[PDB]
């Protein structure tokens, strides 16, 4: 449609301005990184990964036989943050619901020693998990930049992470969040509420009908009374604006 670069940049900036926050979205086409939004310097700043870490948590647990994809993690009957989490679920269902307690159980099964060795082997973010195996991705000290998140998504989309092909495919199946005219969007959201300022993520890739995979990572400041779906809305509008979906 012969739209200028300046127009795409202004349009995507306006999506973040209109949400009254500050954020970036990084897109990778082949080997080229493009950064859009209203706070471009966020691209190389470190933030806690929050629930985006569930992707790597699942890879590590499955690869090291701490769970299977069919295993049901039973609700223990204790009050959880959301009623929707007060049920028995597989890793895949827990992924879609972002169910922290299930992923905490998986991290505890893995254990601190194996988790640190695996996070190092994958070279995820600053690779530091500290000494608490069940919350390091929520409150620190683990941190990652939006550029590193988009590169992680690109490696996963292409089966390039240091895990069996089968492990990567099993986790990818858990991440399908939308279909749009022959395009499929795979992504994981994150919301770091236990850090200030709060951080929101949506990191994934578009698989186009022709098979091409386009990784992205949205990163923004979450604020009071903001809905979680703003992450999806900004991401989808940006991807549509760029003709990616
Ligand atoms: C993944 O990003 C899950 C985040 N869960 C948050 C939330 O949903 O608000 C809680 C509060 C856990 N969390 C995030 C940061 N510090 N704690 S929820 O699981 O109780």
φ, ψ of residue 183 in degrees (nearest 5):
-90, 145
| Distance between CA atoms of residues 26 and 108, nearest Å | 32
Q: For the chain, how many residues are written? A: 245
Q: Decide: 209 and 183 in contact? Cβ < 8 Å.
A: yes
d(CA 20, CA 227): 12
- CA separation for the pair 13, 25 (Å, rounded): 10
What letter would DSSP give residue 62?
H
Pocket probe mutation, ligand 1, options 57, 100, 101, 226, max atoms within 8 Å of Cβ: 100
What is the rounded CA–CA span in Å between residue 9 and residue 241?
Answer: 10
Domains of the chain are 1-245 (3.40.710.10)
| C-alpha 74, offset from chain centre | 24
β-strands 213-222, 176-180 pairing: unpaired
Contact 244, 235 (CB under 8 A): no
Residue 235 and residue 150 in contact, taking contact as beta carbons nearer than 8 Å: no
Angle, helix 100-110 to helix 54-63, in steps of 10 degrees: 40
Going by alpha carbons, the residue nearest to atom 19 of ligand 1 is: 100
Sign of CA dihedral 44, 47, 51, 56: positive
Mutation pick for ligand 1 pocket among 84, 85, 134, 193 (CB with most ligand atoms within 8 Å): 193
């Amino acid at each position: 449609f012969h739209i200028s670069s300046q127009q795409h940049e202004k349009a995507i900036k306006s999506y973040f301005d209109e949400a009254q926050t500050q954020g970036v979205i990084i897109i990778k086409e082949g080997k080229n990184l493009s950064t859009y939004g209203n706070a471009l310097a966020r691209a190389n700043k470190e933030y806690v990964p929050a629930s985006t870490f569930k992707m790597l948590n699942a890879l590590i647990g499955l690869e090291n036989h701490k769970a299977t994809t069919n295993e049901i993690f039973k609700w223990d009957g204790k009050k959880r943050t959301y009623p929707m989490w007060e049920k028995d679920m597989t890793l895949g269902e827990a992924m879609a619901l972002s169910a922290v307690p299930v992923y905490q159980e998986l991290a505890r099964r893995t254990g601190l020693e194996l988790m640190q060795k695996e996070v190092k082997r994958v070279n995820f973010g600053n690779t530091n998990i500290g000494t608490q195996v069940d919350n390091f991705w929520l409150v620190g000290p683990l941190k990652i930049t939006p550029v590193q998140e988009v590169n992680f998504a690109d490696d996963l989309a292409h089966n390039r992470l240091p895990f069996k092909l089968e492990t990567q495919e099993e986790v990818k199946k858990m991440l399908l969040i939308k279909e749009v005219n022959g395009s499929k969007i795979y992504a994981k959201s994150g919301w770091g509420m236990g850090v200030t300022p709060q951080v929101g993520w949506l990191t994934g890739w578009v698989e186009q009908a022709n098979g091409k995979k386009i990784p992205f990572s949205l990163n923004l400041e979450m604020k009071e009374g903001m809905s979680g779906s703003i992450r999806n809305e900004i991401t989808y509008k940006s991807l549509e604006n760029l003709g990616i979906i």
